[PDB]
């Protein structure tokens, strides 16, 4: 019940920032471009150095015109408004946000450790205790987000960074949305999509718990529960209602996954009467000290190699591209509140 006490205070803090979001807290010329850490349809993330403090940050640059073409205006506004309002040990903090004639900018704490994806693929798979450590942090993070009426909708190793302490840092709130009712947007990542999303149904926060099942599976197995060469083939497997576990999977783990990867919403863990407690009290988490996890007092199974505050060895290489700023303002009305 001390959790309710914590969540109560947490919601008070969130709501004040949610209703009065911070805007224009920095300028581009206050940062030094160093290296591109990632790129996508929109947009790109770069390692930057804040001259005033000497601190290194991860700066995402979004081309406003490209955001409009992809019809991601509202989603982008969601992301920024939510990020500036949230506060949790396993969520990357948004330090600054601003915009110019051409681009939108979000400056967050840099995590040299790299993505879980990279470490998972290289090592092959995590031991159950190793996967349990990460899973526990996601469980607490979702408990926090959901209590604020927030749905995440993009859980995957690619969006999970490993800090110097070996703990998880959740990134990419591109599809994050505050909603109390049901929602309908087709979004996420194929391997992690819940059946109700694929079937174009009205869904809720239960999709995040399904994604957790996929994450835990992939961490412990080394591969997703549903994989193929094409997304369409993946969707067929997801809606089939069948799943196969590796022989090394423990009985407790398989039981937990059958409850998370449950097509029936009236039976899926995290969406029942007991809520998240059905997960936190499961046998697979019997050895998990939730308070110790939150307080970061638990010893991490893996610590990334540190080579400096601005080291990028733990990240792959990407093609560098100019940061062009038009002389004319683009999409002014669309991103007025950003």
């Amino acid at each position: 019940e001390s959790v309710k006490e914590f969540l109560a205070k947490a919601k008070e803090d969130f709501l004040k920032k949610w209703e009065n979001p911070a805007q224009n807290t920095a300028h581009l010329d206050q940062f030094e471009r160093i290296k591109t850490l990632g790129t996508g349809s929109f947009g790109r993330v770069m390692l930057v150095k804040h001259m005033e403090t000497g601190n290194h940050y991860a700066m995402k640059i979004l081309d406003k015109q490209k955001v409009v073409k992809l019809k991601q205006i509202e989603h982008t506004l969601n992301e920024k408004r939510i990020l500036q309002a949230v506060n949790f040990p396993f969520l990357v903090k948004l330090e600054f946000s601003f915009k110019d004639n051409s681009n939108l900018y979000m400056v967050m704490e840099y995590v040299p450790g790299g993505e879980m994806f990279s470490h998972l693929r290289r090592i092959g798979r995590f031991s159950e205790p190793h996967a349990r450590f990460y899973a526990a942090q996601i469980v607490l993070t979702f408990e926090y987000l959901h209590s604020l009426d927030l749905i995440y909708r993009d859980l995957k190793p690619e969006n999970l960074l490993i800090d110097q302490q070996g703990y998880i840092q959740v990134t990419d709130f591109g599809f994050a949305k505050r909603v109390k009712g049901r929602t309908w947007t087709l979004c996420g990542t194929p391997e992690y999509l819940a059946p109700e999303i694929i079937l174009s149904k009205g869904y809720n926060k239960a999709v995040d718990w399904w994604a957790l099942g996929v994450l835990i599976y992939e961490m412990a197995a080394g591969y997703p529960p549903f994989f193929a060469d094409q997304p369409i083939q993946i969707y067929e497997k997801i809606v089939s209602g069948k799943v196969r576990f590796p022989s090394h999977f423990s009985s407790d783990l398989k039981d937990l996954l059958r409850n998370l990867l449950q097509v029936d919403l009236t039976k899926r863990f995290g969406n029942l009467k007991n809520g998240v407690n059905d997960i936190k009290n499961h046998k697979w988490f019997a050895t998990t000290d939730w308070i110790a996890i939150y307080q970061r007092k638990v010893e991490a199974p893996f610590i990334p190699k540190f080579k400096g505050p601005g080291d990028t060895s733990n990240f792959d290489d990407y093609e560098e591209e100019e940061i062009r700023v038009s002389i004319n303002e683009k999409c002014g009305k669309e991103f007025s509140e950003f």
Partner: peptide, 20 residues
């Protein structure tokens, strides 16, 4: 093996998000 099948698939790299 399932592992071999995954490693030989075209989706072992970073996976992009999808949307309408």
């Amino acid at each position: 093996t399932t592992y071999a099948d995954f490693i030989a698939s075209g989706r072992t790299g970073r996976r992009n998000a999808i949307h309408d």
